[PDB]
Amino acid sequence: MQAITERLEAMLAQGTDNMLLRFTLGKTYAEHEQFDAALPHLRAALDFDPTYSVAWKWLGKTLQGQGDRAGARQAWESGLAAAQSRGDQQVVKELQVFLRRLAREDALEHHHHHH
Numbered sequence: 369m370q371a372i373t374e375r376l377e378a379m380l381a382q383g384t385d386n387m388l389l390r391f392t393l394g395k396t397y398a399e400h401e402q403f404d405a406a407l408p409h410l411r412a413a414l415d416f417d418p419t420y421s422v423a424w425k426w427l428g429k430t431l432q433g434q435g436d437r438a439g440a441r442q443a444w445e446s447g448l449a450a451a452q453s454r455g456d457q458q459v460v461k462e463l464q465v466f467l468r469r470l471a472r473e474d475a476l477e478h479h480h481h482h483h
Contacts, residue, residue: 372396387417398426403433421459424450428463432470440470 369375373396376389390413397406407430414423424447431439444467451459475481 387413387420390416391420391423394423395426398430398433401433403430406430407434419454421451421454421456425459425463428466432466437470437473441467441474444470 373393376393380389390409394406394410394413397403397409406426410423410427410430413420414427428440428444428447431443444463447463448460448467451457451463471480
């Protein structure tokens with residue numbers, strides 16, 4: 369049937385506890401902007417396999433989508449060095465772009481504006 373989560377539940381109930389299966393289910397929550405529900409699920413995955421670069425990139429989106437500007441800032445700052453340590457320039461730059469855009473809002477309320 370429809371919904372990736374629903375069909376995955378079948379194989380999860382078969383005792384096939386795999387790495388990517390944790391991530392895919394979490395992505396669906398984040399895509400639906402259900403970052404609140406995503407947080408516990410993604411956190412559970414990071415406990416088992418914290419070396420998944422793509423997950424770091426979603427985590428950053430999680431905090432900003434939740435509505436925590438400070439959390440989003442700290443998240444990208446944390447994941448940046450993680451991506452650096454993994455040598456994944458693509459992820460570093462991807463997260464960096466969002467981190468800049470977030471700063472532009474800080475620039476407004478916290479007057480980090482160029483003027």
